[PDB]
């Protein structure tokens, strides 16, 4: 077994898929993480990207790739997988064909806005995502490959699923798609997949409780997000918890994932 994690960004496998990651290592799968936005970037940084560094317990000019690329070895290490970094900008770091940055910082408002853009500019960036996770697939040979729902629509888990779709289904690999973690604890789960692609049935994984501690503990290497995910409640563990509780509810922690097959006709 040969298992291909394709994460959006540095931390959404461990969050959504940390458990499964470390139960594939210890059954003796070869594991590797490849992260897709985990492009270096370098100043000058975008007045969004300064405030995210600082978000993230960083002064606004520091290395933030460098920073959370540490912190995912280190995570991934504590589940003891393999990792990659990928060559692609995070969206605050992008800019636009005419030199505008992709994200920008709205005064008053807190959810960071994405400035419009033509449909070639993200055609483009799936294509050469894709491009990438057919070379990976070459190289590693997976049996099976698991990327995200983009559960919570944030652009870069869309370009993530859907350049991992087409990827997969050129090369002709089993693909799975996770559960956005914590996105979907205030998401309905719903999602657009691309013409020609559907879910299967979910499958509600049954873990051992030193893997659900294995998962947290790995959590906590990405020092950079705690304060972000865990909220005003400081709270994202419970919440984790909570939510494998619903979808089991005689049952121990678990992550939700479903197959992604060819629709009828197509
Ligand atoms: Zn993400």
Redesign the pocket.
């Given at each position: 077994t040969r298992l291909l994690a394709i994460?959006?960004?540095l931390?959404?496998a461990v969050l959504s898929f940390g458990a499964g990651l470390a139960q594939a290592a210890q059954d003796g799968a070869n594991v590797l993480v490849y992260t897709v936005?985990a492009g270096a970037a370098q100043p000058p940084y975008s007045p969004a990207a300064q405030r995210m560094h600082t978000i993230w317990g960083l002064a606004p000019d520091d290395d933030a790739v460098l920073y959370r690329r540490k912190e995912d070895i280190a995570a991934l290490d504590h589940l003891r997988v393999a990792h990659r970094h990928g060559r692609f900008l995070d969206s605050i770091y992008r800019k636009l064909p005419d030199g505008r940055w992709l994200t920008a910082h709205v005064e008053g408002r807190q959810k960071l806005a994405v400035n419009d853009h033509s449909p070639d500019s993200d055609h483009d960036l799936v294509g050469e995502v894709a491009d990438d996770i057919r070379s990976i697939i070459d190289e590693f040979d997976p049996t099976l490959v698991v990327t995200?729902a983009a559960i919570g629509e944030?652009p870069?888990?869309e370009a993530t699923r859907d350049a991992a779709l087409f990827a997969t289904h050129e090369k002709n690999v089993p693909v799975r798609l996770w559960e956005?973690l914590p996105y979907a604890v205030f998401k309905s789960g719903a999602v657009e997949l691309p013409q020609g692609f559907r879910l299967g049935s979910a499958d509600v994984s049954s873990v051992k409780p030193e893997m659900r501690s294995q998962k947290f503990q790995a959590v906590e290497r990405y020092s950079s997000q705690m304060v972000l995910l865990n909220g005003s409640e400081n709270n994202l563990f419970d919440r984790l918890d909570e939510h494998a509780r619903q979808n089991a509810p005689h049952g121990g922690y678990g992550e939700t994932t479903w197959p992604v097959v060819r629709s009828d006709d197509s």
């Amino acid at each position: 077994t040969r298992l291909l994690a394709i994460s959006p960004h540095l931390d959404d496998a461990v969050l959504s898929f940390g458990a499964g990651l470390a139960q594939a290592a210890q059954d003796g799968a070869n594991v590797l993480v490849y992260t897709v936005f985990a492009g270096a970037a370098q100043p000058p940084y975008s007045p969004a990207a300064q405030r995210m560094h600082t978000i993230w317990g960083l002064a606004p000019d520091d290395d933030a790739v460098l920073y959370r690329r540490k912190e995912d070895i280190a995570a991934l290490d504590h589940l003891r997988v393999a990792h990659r970094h990928g060559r692609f900008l995070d969206s605050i770091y992008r800019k636009l064909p005419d030199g505008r940055w992709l994200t920008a910082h709205v005064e008053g408002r807190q959810k960071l806005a994405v400035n419009d853009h033509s449909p070639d500019s993200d055609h483009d960036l799936v294509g050469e995502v894709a491009d990438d996770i057919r070379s990976i697939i070459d190289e590693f040979d997976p049996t099976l490959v698991v990327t995200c729902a983009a559960i919570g629509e944030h652009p870069d888990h869309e370009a993530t699923r859907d350049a991992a779709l087409f990827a997969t289904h050129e090369k002709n690999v089993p693909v799975r798609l996770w559960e956005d973690l914590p996105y979907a604890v205030f998401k309905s789960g719903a999602v657009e997949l691309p013409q020609g692609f559907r879910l299967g049935s979910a499958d509600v994984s049954s873990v051992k409780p030193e893997m659900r501690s294995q998962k947290f503990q790995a959590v906590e290497r990405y020092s950079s997000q705690m304060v972000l995910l865990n909220g005003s409640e400081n709270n994202l563990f419970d919440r984790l918890d909570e939510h494998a509780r619903q979808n089991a509810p005689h049952g121990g922690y678990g992550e939700t994932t479903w197959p992604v097959v060819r629709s009828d006709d197509s």
